[PDB]
DNA sequence: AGTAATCCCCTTGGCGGTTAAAACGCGGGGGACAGCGCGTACGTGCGTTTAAGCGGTGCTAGAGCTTGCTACGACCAATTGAGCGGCCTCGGCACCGGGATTCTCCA
DNA sequence: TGGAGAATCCCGGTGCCGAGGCCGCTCAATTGGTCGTAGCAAGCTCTAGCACCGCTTAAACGCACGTACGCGCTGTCCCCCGCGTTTTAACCGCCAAGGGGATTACTCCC
């Protein structure tokens, strides 16, 4: 059997957002910053909903990368307040709040945002004056721009601030002259057309699906898969690591999906994630004796009721035979009068009752009464012994039938098996409503198994009911048997179809998760084919953009994401179009690197807003520039 | 045929007045018609079941009263 | 859900109003408890709808009283 | 003699019964209201269960007497 | 003993009209519903203690079953009057009109 | 507070139809005796219901304290009410029909 042949399963421990070590204030960064030439130093903050990434413009990578979360609480034992603002929170008490509105790119809890920024400036080593470059959501809300500016200029007093878009910084860092920028991030997916290094933000589109939504959706699907119960505490922080580690984009979803749960090869399509389970004769002899006596008592009680039914049925039988002894040679009125004493109405009803009692009985001062009761048991024993005689010789006759008419005898077993299955079907398909054989079926199928070379176990009724012929076992537990007793085989989830079903929401949002928005290929194709050729200032559209479709943000890092997008776009473009899909180098940090390289250029310093310009114009005002919002 | 629309807006209003209702959303009227016919479709199928099982081709007042009494809504006055 | 011993004592205490020195078969108390738990659980379901209908997530005594009034228990 | 045993259905027990009814949050006045509900119920069940016991001239109340009392609700 | 015509009765269907009830229009009001601020009242976590739950021992009330018979209800035939179907009438309740009292709403 | 006017009440008059009593009779309730039996009573069995002790630890309680949510407040606007107009179909009466169920005739078959 396959589960006996298959190797032991390979299993992956659950991963979650966890603290690992402290990091001190990085005073060498402050030292290096004070050493830079005038107007060539800035603090660069990539304000990401998954990670805030921060560092110095003159360095090649962030010094900090922390979730935009705070935890603040009063210790009920020690009696003092504690406060935390990143991965310093163990994501020990997880009183967590998040700066962003859940599943969106917009900051809305400004108290968390200040705590996150306090942690940033502390760990960058600021103690008392530095220009700030901060990334911003596409089409970011003016109220959030205002609130962020107020914090930067009036809480922290910074000399100058500029906002730009993480998608576009990533593009310019990778030599983006002109192209279609495709960003899938934690919060969102965007397609932005970029022309002559300037983004055409009036033509940008947002999907409202991203790496957060995939973690939440993977969580819903797992809580549905194991809806009858799962012992581990399923958190979307865990399903995020499952989506990172195990999910991939299909190159032909319907053909890969339709075969995914087929038992052959599911061993290699499944992946198994295991939660931290706990491993759990005089005693037994005495208890078993008490059980054995209790069972014996139940057996005696059944036999005592059976013996009461034996004596009752034999006494009933004797009475009905006493009628028959009269009825033979007596009138219909005597027949009717004796039947009326039974309140029966037919001699053959007495025959049926006489036989049916015998058919039941065969299965199962004082001395004259006691022995005549024992003689009713001897009348029962005569039915019981005649039953024994009947069965022994009838079986020997059938053994001759097997020897003498083997093929017809096999053909009989088929005809009987079907007829018995028909009665079971006539029972069950009806009783499935009307409720509001089996050993005979087996015995027939057993001889068919024994000697009918046309028969197989796969047609056995039990095989129709077997777990390894089911689909939901493959879905929930894969190629291998399952028992709830094993603490190691409980506490594990089998990902199966969700390996591919979760990434495919980007391509099929309404069909898979009901998002009611166009898929990624349809968004990009609407821009390339319908919009940009209509926009009158543009030249060489679409073709100039097709030469660089560019992938950015962590939620693009799925395997086959590029080739899926290429093959999807290839069918929407005219034949021989020079379509190139390209990945960013290091598609997460690369948006910060773009902001850092841009930070002190003349283009950036023309776009900087000073504290005094902020006091003049207010916090909604922005210098419009290639990499930022209008 | 749709004589359910013969249960007019004034009639559904009058029933709500006897029920002690002061102000009635205009959406109530189609909800009330849907509720009324679901009631009738239970009582008549039982009243028919009685005439059918009692082998008559007319429906008597007592067929309804048995139907109601079995539905749980004992009616006094029409036999019963 | 309800603790067994304080439910036994509640049953005895109630029964004494009708006949002194009754006895209760052990299976009779469990049959009372299982009906009471099923009754309270089934009423809280109906109160939760009364709260949710009044836009309140928190159930309140007037939610019990509306449920019972419509169930005809009052 | 027995008195005040209705305070034996504790407030955590009433929480458990409410949560299994799907309740999210519980007004602090529910706990005495639940007891006025449980007692009025359990009295008129036991009233019948005992009536079925003094009929048939017996002194244990049986599970069948309970079943016949519930069946009368 | 069967099958079809004849004849009672009672239900369904149509026609006319008349008028009382349903439908339609329109101004405005006020009640539904979204939005805001606060504050208090319910969910959470900890240390405390309380008694529910289990394993075990002892007793006797009384549930459950059998035996024996006679008091009480089932069954039938003859007797009769309490209760039902049909006819009568007069008085209670409705229905109208008209003047008197109440209630409602804008001033 | 007043007032106007509509809406609700009351008082006496009219008439019609159904409530209350009378009559004839049937047939269902009663009187009288029979006979079977079941369930009332006395008696034994042993189940299981009640009582108590001692231990364990999970379940219940009292308290600190934060913030999520119930509630009164404000503004609007839309949509359901009160009233006049238009129209349609419910109600009434009278005639038709058909159907069905009980009865009666006449023949063939037993
Ligand atoms: N190798 C990977 N494969 C797939 N997904 C990944 C991988 N690494 C990270 N992710 C996921 O991609 C997301 C990270 O996106 P990224 O950090 O680029 O965005 P962000 O700047 O935090 O977000 P936003 O711009 O929406 O505010 C997370 O959902 C993360 O789980
Ligand atoms: Mg990002």
Q: Are D35 and C32 in contact (CB under 8 A)?
A: no
- 3-class DSSP state for residue A499? helix
Do A263 and A129 fall within a single domain?
Answer: no
Tell me how far apart the alpha carbons of residues A31 and A125 are, in angstroms, rounded to a whole number: 9
User: Would A121 be classed as within a structural domain?
Assistant: yes
Residues A467 and A337 in one domain: yes
Whether chain D has a CB inside 8 Å of the CB on C32: the answer is yes
Using the 3D structure, point to which of A473, A492, A516 is the last residue of a domain.
A516
Strand residue runs (E) in A100-246: 132-136, 160-165, 179-184, 189-195, 198-199, 205-206
A433 with A223: CB under 8 angstroms? no
Rg (CA), chain C: 16
* C72 backbone φψ class: left, alpha, beta (φ>0; ψ -120 to 50): left
Long-range CB contact pairs, C51-60, < 8 A, 24+: C51/D23, C57/D24, C57/D25, C58/D24, C58/D25, C58/D26, C58/D27, C59/D18, C59/D23, C59/D25, C59/D26, C59/D27, C59/D30, C60/D27, C60/D29, C60/D30
CA of A265 to C1' of E106 (A): 87
Instruction: Give CA–CA dist A150/A281, Å, rounded.
Output: 76
Q: List the structure tokens of D73.
A: 């609700």
The CA-atom distances, in angstroms, between B35 and each of A171, A481, A585, B4, B31 are 62, 50, 65, 11, 6
Going across the sheet that includes A11-13, the strands are A11-13, A272-274, A492-494
Q: Which of A144, A149, A86 is nearest to A120 (CA)?
A: A86
Nearest to D26 among C31, C41, C58 (CB): C58
Assess whether A404 and A297 both reside in one domain: yes
- D68: closest CA of chain C, how far (Å): 11
List strand E contacts in D 39-68 (CB < 7 A): 57-60, 62
Measure D60 CA to nearest chain C CA, in Å.
4
d(CA D65, CA D45): 10
Q: Are residues A194 and A218 in the same domain?
A: no
Q: Indicate if ligand 1 lies below 6 Å from the C-beta of A548.
A: no
Q: What is the distance between the alpha carbons of residues D73 and A497, in angstroms, rounded to a whole number?
A: 50
* C17, burial (CB in 10 Å: exposed 0-12, middle 13-18, buried 19+): exposed
Q: Is A557 in the pocket of ligand 1 (CB under 6 A)?
A: yes
C13 contacts D2? CB cut-off 8 A: yes
Q: Residue D45 has which token pair?
A: 């069940």
Q: Is A411 assigned to a binding site?
A: no
Do A128 and A194 share a domain, yes or no? no
Continuous H helices in A52-131 = 110-123
- Three-state SS for chain D is CCCCHHHHCCHHHHHHHHHHCCCCEECCCHHHHHHHHHHHHHHHHHHHHHHHHHCCCCCEECHHHHHHHHHCC
CB A339 within 8 A of CB A347: yes
Size of interface C-D (CB pairs under 8 A): 144
Whether A626 maps to a domain, the answer reads no
Contact D65, C22 (CB under 8 A): no
What ligand has the least distance to the C-alpha of A184? 1
C-alpha angle A222/A227/A230, rounded to 5°? Answer: 75
Please answer whether residues C51 and C61 qualify as being in contact, where contact means their C-beta atoms are separated by less than 8 angstroms: no
Residue A185 is assigned to a ligand binding site: yes
Report the greatest alpha carbon distance in chain A.
134
Confirm whether any atom of chain E, the nucleic acid strand, is less than 7 Å from CB of C21. Answer: yes
Ligand 2: centre distance to CA A248 (Å): 20
- Going by C-alpha positions, the residue among D13, D22, D68 that lies closest to residue D45 is D68
Tokens of A201: 């933000």
Nearest alpha carbon to residue A120 among A189, A67, A165, A197:
A67
Q: How far is CA A456 from CA A4, A419, A449, A464, A614, in A?
A: 20, 18, 6, 12, 84
Contact (Cβ atoms closer than 8 angstroms) between residue A270 and residue A494: yes
What dihedral do alpha carbons A585, A586, A592, A597 form, nearest 10°? -40
Distance (Å, whole) CA A134 – CA A596: 10
Give distance in angstroms: CA of A514 to centre of ligand 2.
24
Task: Please give the C-alpha separations between residue A223 and each of A1, A26, A236, A239, A505, in angstroms, as whole numbers.
Answer: 31, 43, 11, 11, 18
- Select from C22, C49, C52 the residue whose CB has the most chain D CBs within 10 Å, as the one to mutate to test that interface: C22
Say if CB A572 and CB A546 are below 8 A apart: no
Q: Mapping DSSP to helix (H, G, I), strand (E, B) and coil, where does residue A82 land?
A: strand
A590 lines ligand 1 (CB under 6 A): no
Q: Please measure the distance between the N-terminal and C-terminal CA atoms of chain B and give it in whole angstroms.
A: 32
**Residue A573 · residue A546 · CB < 8 Å:** yes
Residue A281 and residue A619: Cα distance in Å, rounded?
A: 80
Method used experimentally? cryo-EM
| CB-count exposure of residue B38 (10 Å: 0-12, 13-18, 19+) | exposed
Residue pair A182/A549 in contact (Cβ under 8 Å)? The answer is yes
Q: How many CB atoms are located within 10 Å of the residue C2 CB?
A: 20
Phi/psi of residue A192, each to 5°? -120, 120
Label residues D35-73 b or e (16+ Cβ within 10 Å = b).
Answer: bebbbebbeebbebbbebbeeeeeeebbbebbeebbeee
User: From ligand 1's centre to the CA of A552, what distance in Å?
Assistant: 10
* Spatial separation of the C-alpha atoms in residues A456 and A414, rounded to whole Å: 12
| Maximum alpha-carbon separation in chain C | 49
CA dihedral of B64, B66, B70, B76, whole degrees rounded to 10: 80
Closest listed ligand to the CA of A246? 1
Strands of A239-278 (E only): list them. Answer: 272-274
Determine the Cα–Cα distance for residues A352 and A49; give it in Å rounded to an integer: 82
Residue A445 CA to residue A448 CA, distance in Å, equals 5
The response to whether A443 counts as a known ligand-binding position is no
Closest to A165 (Cα-Cα) out of A187, A200, A140, A197: A140
What Å value separates CA B48 and C1' E46?
68
User: If you ran DSSP here, which 8-state letter would residue A528 be given?
Assistant: I
Q: How far is CA D64 from CA A508, C24, D52, D68, in A?
A: 60, 11, 9, 6
Decide: CB of B9 under 7 A of nucleic strand E. yes
Q: In the structure, do chain D and chain C come into contact, i.e. share 3 or more CB pairs under 8 Å?
A: yes
Are D60 and C27 contacting, i.e. CB atoms less than 8 angstroms apart? Answer: no
Q: Is residue A211 in contact with ligand 1, taking CB distance under 6 Å?
A: yes
Smallest CA-to-CA distance from C12 within C33, C34, C35 is with: C33
Residue whose C-alpha is closest to residue A135's, from A39, A26, A66, A49: A49
Residue where one domain finishes, among candidates A498, A516, A534: A516
| Tokens (6 digits) for C61 | 């005594």
Query: Based on C-alpha coordinates, what's the Rg of chain A?
Result: 40
Question: Tokens 């006091």 label which residue?
Answer: A615
What separation in angstroms does the CA of B38 have from each of B7, B33, B35, B57, B66?
A: 14, 9, 5, 24, 18
The H or E element containing residue A43 is: strand A43-47
From chain C, the residues in CB contact with D15 under 8 A are none
Q: How many residues does chain D have?
A: 73
Q: Report how many helices (DSSP H) and strands (DSSP E) chain C contains, helices first.
A: 3, 2
Q: What is the CATH number of the domain that holds D70?
A: 1.10.20.10
Q: Does C42 sit within 8 Å of D21, measured CB to CB?
A: yes
Contacts of A589 (CB under 8 A, 6+ apart): A53, A61, A62
Q: Are A514 and A521 in contact (CB under 8 A)?
A: no
Range of the domain at A339: 210-516
- Write down the residue that tokens 């309404």 correspond to: A510
Looking at chain B, the number of H-run helices and the number of E-run strands are 3, 0
CB-based burial label for A471 (10 Å; 0-12, 13-18, 19+): exposed
Contact A153, A119 (CB under 8 A): no
Same domain for A431 and A306?
yes
Cα–Cα distance for residue pair C67/C46, rounded to 1 Å: 6
How long, in residues, is chain B? 80
Answer whether A107's CB lies under 8 Å from A47's CB.
yes
User: C47, C51, C66: which to substitute to probe chain D, counting the most D Cβ within 10 Å?
Assistant: C47
Domain count, chain C: 1
8 A C-beta contact, residue A66 and residue A123: no
Q: How many domains does chain A have?
A: 3
Rounded Cα gap, residues A30 and A220, in angstroms = 45
C-alpha span between A397 and A400 (Å, rounded): 5
A317 alpha carbon, distance to own chain's centre: 63
Same domain, A215 and A198: no
Distance A353 CA to ligand 1 centre (A): 80
Residue A197 lies in a domain: yes
Q: Do D2 and C12 touch (CB under 8 A)?
A: yes
Of the candidates A221, A279, A226, A186, the one whose C-alpha atom is nearest the C-alpha of residue A486 is A279
What is the nearest nucleotide to C6, using C1' and CA? E52
Contacts of A336 (CB under 8 A, 6+ apart): A345
* DSSP 8-state class, residue B55: T
Subunits with at least 3 CB pairs below 8 A relative to chain B?
Answer: none
Residues 6+ apart with CB under 8 A from B4: B33, B36, B37
The dihedral region occupied by A61, where left means phi > 0, alpha psi between -120 and 50, and beta the remainder, is beta
How many helices (DSSP H) and strands (DSSP E) are in chain A? 25, 18
CA distance A9 to A263: 15
CB of A50 closer than 6 A to ligand 1? Answer: yes
Whole-number Cα distances in Å, A543 to A181, A502, A567, A576: 15, 32, 16, 11
CA–CA distance, A218 with A223 (Å, rounded to integer)? 9
Protein CB footprint (7 Å) on chain E nucleotides: 11-12, 21-23, 31-32, 41-43, 45-47, 51-53, 61-64
Which 3 state secondary structure label does DSSP give A58?
Answer: coil
Residue nearest to atom 10 of ligand 1 (CA): A554
Decide: A90 and A18 in contact? Cβ < 8 Å.
yes
Chains in touch with A (3+ beta-carbon pairs under 8 Å) read none
* Residues spanned by the domain of C30: 1-74
The number of domains in chain D is: 1
Nearest to C57 among D25, D51, D70 (CB): D25
Q: Does C58 contact D24 at a Cβ distance shorter than 8 Å?
A: yes
CATH number, domain with residue C28: 1.10.20.10
- Shared domain for A133 and A235, answered yes or no, is no
Distance CA B62, CA B68 (A): 10
Do A244 and A318 sit in the same domain of this protein?
Answer: yes
Q: Which nucleotide lies at the shortest CA–C1' distance from D24?
A: E43
CA distance A496 to A224: 14
A535 and A464 housed in the same domain: no
Please state, in angstroms and rounded to a whole number, the distance separating the CA atoms of residues A473 and A458. 18
Pocket test for ligand 1, best of A554, A586, A592 (most atoms within 8 A of CB): A554
CA torsion angle A273 A513 A515 A237 (round to 10): -20
| One domain, residues A377 and A313 | yes
Give the count of alpha carbons within 13 A of A568, CB side only.
26
CA A66 distance to own-chain centroid: 28
SS3 A417: helix
A114: which 2 tokens?
Answer: 């200040």
Q: Which positions in strand F are less than 7 Å from the protein's CB atoms?
A: 48-50, 59-61, 65-67, 69-71, 79-81, 90, 100-101
Say whether A610 sits in a helix, a strand or coil.
Answer: strand
Q: How far apart are CA A291 and CA A298, in angstroms?
A: 10
Structural domain for D56, as ranges:
1-73
B10 CA – F85 C1', rounded, Å:
18
Q: Is A555's C-beta closer than 6 angstroms to any atom of ligand 1?
A: yes
- Set of chain C residues whose Cβ sits within 8 Å of the Cβ of D66: 28, 31-32, 35
């Amino acid at each position: 059997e396959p589960w006996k042949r298959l190797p032991p399963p390979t299993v992956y421990p659950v991963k979650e957002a966890r603290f690992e070590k402290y990091i001190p204030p990085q005073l060498d960064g402050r030292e290096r910053a004070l050493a830079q030439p005038p107007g060539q130093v800035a603090i660069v903050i990539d304000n990401g909903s998954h990670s805030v990434r921060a560092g110095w413009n003159f360095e090649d990578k962030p010094r900090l990368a922390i979730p935009p979360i705070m935890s603040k609480y009063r210790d009920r034992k020690m009696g003092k307040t504690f406060s935390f603002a990143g991965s310093d929170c163990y994501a020990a008490r997880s009183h967590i709040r998040n700066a962003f509105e859940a599943g969106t790119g917009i900051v809305s809890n400004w108290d968390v945002m200040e705590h996150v920024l306090d942690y940033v400036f502390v760990k960058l080593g600021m103690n008392e004056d530095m220009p700030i470059v901060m990334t911003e959501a596409v089409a970011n809300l003016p109220y959030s721009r205002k609130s962020m500016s107020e914090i930067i200029f009036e809480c922290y007093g910074a000399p100058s601030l500029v906002y730009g878009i993480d998608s576009l910084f990533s593009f310019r860092h990778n030599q983006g002259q002109t192209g279609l920028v495709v960003s899938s991030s934690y919060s969102a997916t965007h397609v932005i057309p970029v022309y002559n290094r300037k983004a055409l933000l009036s033509q940008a589109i947002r999907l409202n699906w991203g790496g957060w939504h995939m973690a939440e959706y993977m969580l819903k699907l797992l809580k549905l898969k194991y809806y009858t119960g799962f012992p581990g505490k399923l958190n979307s922080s865990q399903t995020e690591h499952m989506v990172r580690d195990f999910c991939y984009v299909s190159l032909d979803y319907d053909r890969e999906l339709a075969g995914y749960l087929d038992w052959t090869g599911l061993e290699d399509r499944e992946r198994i994630v295991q939660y931290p389970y706990t491993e759990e004769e005089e005693e037994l002899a005495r208890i078993a004796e008490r059980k054995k006596e209790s069972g014996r008592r139940l057996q005696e009680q059944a036999a005592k009721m059976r013996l009461e039914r034996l004596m009752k049925k034999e006494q009933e039988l004797e009475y009905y035979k006493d009628i028959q002894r009269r009825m033979q040679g007596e009138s219909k009125k005597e027949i009717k009068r004796l039947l009326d004493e039974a309140e029966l109405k037919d001699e053959a009803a007495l025959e049926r009752v006489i036989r049916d009692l015998e058919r039941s009985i065969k299965r199962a001062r004082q001395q004259r009464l006691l022995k005549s009761n024992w003689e009713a048991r001897q009348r029962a024993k005569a039915e019981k012994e005649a039953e024994k005689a009947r069965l022994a010789e009838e079986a020997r006759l059938d053994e001759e039938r097997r020897k003498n008419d083997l093929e017809g005898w096999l053909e009989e077993k088929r005809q009987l098996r079907l007829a018995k299955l028909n009665q079971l079907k006539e029972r069950e398909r009806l009783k499935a409503d009307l409720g509001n054989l089996e050993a005979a079926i087996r015995s027939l199928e057993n001889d068919l198994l024994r000697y009918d070379k046309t028969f197989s176990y796969d047609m056995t009724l039990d095989a129709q009911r077997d777990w390894s012929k089911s689909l939901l076992h493959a879905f929930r537990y894969g190629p291998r048997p399952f028992d709830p007793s094993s603490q190691a085989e409980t506490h594990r989830v089998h990902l199966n179809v969700e390996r591919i079903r979760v990434p495919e929401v980007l391509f099929q949002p309404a069909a898979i998760a009901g998002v009611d928005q166009a898929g990624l290929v349809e968004i990009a194709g609407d821009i390339l084919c319908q919009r940009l050729p209509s926009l009158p200032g543009i030249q060489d559209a679409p073709d100039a953009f097709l030469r660089d479709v560019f992938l950015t943000g962590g939620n693009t890092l799925f395997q086959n994401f590029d080739e899926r997008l290429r093959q999807g776009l290839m069918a929407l473009l005219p034949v021989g179009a020079p379509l190139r899909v390209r990945r960013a180098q290091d598609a997460i940090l690369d948006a910060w690197r773009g902001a850092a390289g841009w930070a002190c250029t003349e283009e950036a310093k023309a776009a900087w807003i000073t504290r005094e310009e902020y006091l003049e114009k207010g916090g909604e005002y922005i210098k419009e520039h290639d990499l930022g919002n209008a | 045929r749709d004589n359910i629309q013969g249960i007019t807006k004034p009639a559904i209003r009058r029933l709500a007045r006897r029920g002690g209702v002061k102000r009635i959303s205009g959406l109530i009227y189609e909800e009330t018609r849907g509720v009324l016919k679901v009631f009738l479709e239970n009582v008549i199928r039982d009243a028919v079941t009685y005439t059918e099982h009692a082998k008559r081709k007319t429906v008597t007042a007592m067929d309804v009263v048995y139907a109601l009494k079995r539905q749980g809504r004992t009616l006094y006055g029409f036999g019963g | 859900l309800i603790r067994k011993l304080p439910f036994q004592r509640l049953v005895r205490e109630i029964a004494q109003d009708f006949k002194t020195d009754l006895r209760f078969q052990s299976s009779a108390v469990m049959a009372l408890q299982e009906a009471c738990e099923a009754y309270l659980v089934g009423l809280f379901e109906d109160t939760n709808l009364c709260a949710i209908h009044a836009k309140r997530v928190t159930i309140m005594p007037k939610d019990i009283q509306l449920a019972r009034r419509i169930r005809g228990e009052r």
